[PDB]
């Protein structure tokens, strides 16, 4: 097995919660063992440029500590790919980003890509990779919290947002929020719209596995 | 293990040579068993637009069979993604193109992509888009076999260095024939940046395509 150092850009106390992402990847890809660690003094995580730029140094410090411990690769578990470019320049191992992973892998399924966010607009890393292949973007109206997607109305909201994208002719939907990976909404949506719905956390695992196996 | 139905776009007599791409994928990803089969009357494979047309329905044919016979996913082993789109509208199981795979996976390593060809397939140009910084190919070389010889080797290594000098962060090999001679690691060692092999890239998307639905 391979060991991945996964970074959460939001401070989590519940060990169980902090590890939800690595468990998702390990489940999907057994060859991989994921050690998840979060940044400190940032319980609200990254939701703008300040919190982003504020986390850049913490992310970089953790990523570095993971390499000295022998991790085969890094996965910055955030759709915004916070500090992924910077960290790559610094480490001698692959640096995977949830944002570039979900959008890149979506293209391998269809060139007409639609993006489904929660509340935030579409991350710039995803817009960059998708180019004019980003046909459209949508989100669940009325849903402020990820946990709202679990409710009957919130569930309906995201399903409809998926439907709206499919109706715009997209061939594949990339989810732009790692919190959607956490609730496992993707399979429900794919079920609904009948086209691939890409989970950012699972996608990062696939990319992490390719990086390592391609040697 | 899952079973991948891999389509070779060139008529291959020898069993060893026909199952080249399949073996590569199995070694990189032990979770897949690759059944390789080739199209007929395609001795020279797909090189122009007419030859591509000729092989299209032959691709679509092998695809129908493979599904019918129970393969988990399809892989059209050719960086030009021939019939891929058509094959996706016909079959319901995953259909993976070697070209869309190599270009899409490259984007996950960096945005400034370079393509090392033997010109660039339409599929690769569409997925890379404006992220396609530069492309090249070894001089004097016109066949995979030359890349084995000390000159055809230095040639492809020079082309990759020129792409490296153009500032690319990742290089996508745009020919499925380079996966054969296993040139990728030879270049990456030289130029120092990820060199994405298309055959291995396809195995990776195929495994994601399967694991992600479970």
Length of chain A counted residue by residue: 215
In contact, A209 and A124? CB cutoff 8 Å: no
Instruction: Give the resolution to one decimal, in Å.
Output: 2.2
The CATH code that applies to domain A1-99+201-215 is 3.40.50.1860
Look up residue B26 and give its DSSP letter. Answer: H
Give me the residue spans of the domains in chain A: 1-99+201-215, 100-200
Say if A1-99+201-215 and A100-200 have the same CATH topology: yes
The CATH code that applies to domain B100-198 is 3.40.50.1860
The CATH code that applies to domain A100-200 is 3.40.50.1860
The CATH code that applies to domain B1-99+199-214 is 3.40.50.1860
* Contact yes or no for A133 and B126 at CB 8 A: yes
Q: Find chain A residues with C-beta within 8 A of B207's C-beta.
A: 206, 209
Compute the half-sphere exposure of residue A5: CA atoms within 13 Å on the CB side of its CA. Answer: 23
What Rg, from alpha-carbon coordinates, does chain A have? 16
Planar angle of CA A115, A117, A19, nearest 5 degrees: 115
Q: How far is CA B103 from the centre of its chain?
A: 10
Residues paired with A35 in a beta bridge? A5
Interface of chain A toward chain B, CB-CB under 8 angstroms: 28-29, 88, 94, 96-97, 100-101, 103-109, 111, 128-129, 131-133, 187, 196, 198-199, 202-203, 206-207, 209-211, 213-215
Length of chain B counted residue by residue: 214
* Contact yes or no for B129 and A128 at CB 8 A: no
The H-or-E segment that residue A56 falls in is: helix A49-68
**Tokens for A192?**
């609904």
Look up residue B145 and give its DSSP letter. Answer: G
Q: How was this structure determined?
A: X-ray
* Angstrom distances, CA of residue A97 to CA of A137, B46, B108, B112: 20, 35, 8, 16
For CA atoms A153, A158, A159, A163, the dihedral sign is: positive
Phi, psi of A6 (to 5 degrees): -105, 130
């Amino acid at each position: 097995k391979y060991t991945i150092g996964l970074i959460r850009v939001i401070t989590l106390e519940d060990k169980e919660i902090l590890n939800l992402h690595g468990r998702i990847i390990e489940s999907a890809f057994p060859e991989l063992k994921v050690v998840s660690r979060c940044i400190e003094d940032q319980p609200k995580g990254i939701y703008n440029e300040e919190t982003e730029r504020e986390a850049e140094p913490k992310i970089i410090r953790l990523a570095k500590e993971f390499e000295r411990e022998g991790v085969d690769a890094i996965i910055i578990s955030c759709a915004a790919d916070p500090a992924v470019e910077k960290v790559r320049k610094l480490l001698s191992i692959p640096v995977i980003g949830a944002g570039s992973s979900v959008s890149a892998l979506a293209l391998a399924y269809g060139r007409r890509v639609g993006v489904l966010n929660l509340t935030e607009e579409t991350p710039k890393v995803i817009r960059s990779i998708l180019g004019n292949n980003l046909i459209a973007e949508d989100h669940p109206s009325g849903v402020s919290n990820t946990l709202d997607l679990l409710t009957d109305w919130g569930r309906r909201e995201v399903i409809n947002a998926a439907k709206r994208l499919k109706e715009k002719g997209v061939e594949v939907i990339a989810l732009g929020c790692t919190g959607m990976s956490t609730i496992g909404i993707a399979p429900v949506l794919e079920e609904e719209v009948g086209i691939p719905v890409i989970d950012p956390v699972i996608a990062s695992g696939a990319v992490a596995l390719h990086a390592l196996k391609r040697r």
